Amino acid sequence: MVAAAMLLRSCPVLSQGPTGLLGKVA
């Protein structure tokens, strides 16, 4: 009944990250 944020630190990192570096990974 605790550790709400502590647990939900930075799990969602994917969201907001296109990268778009597959065509020119060079």
Curated annotation (Swiss-Prot):
Q: Name where it's found.
A: Mitochondrion inner membrane; Mitochondrion
Which top-rank group of organisms is this from?
Eukaryota
Tissue specificity annotation:
Predomnantly expressed in erythroid cells.
Annotated family: Belongs to the class-II pyridoxal-phosphate-dependent aminotransferase family.
Provide the domain comment.
C-terminus is a mobile self-inhibitory loop which interferes directly with active site.
Subunit structure, interactors included: Homodimer. Interacts with SUCLA2.
What function is annotated for this protein? Catalyzes the pyridoxal 5'-phosphate (PLP)-dependent condensation of succinyl-CoA and glycine to form aminolevulinic acid (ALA), with CoA and CO2 as by-products. Contributes significantly to heme formation during erythropoiesis.
- The name this protein carries in UniProt is 5-aminolevulinate synthase, erythroid-specific, mitochondrial
| Species | Mus musculus (Mouse)
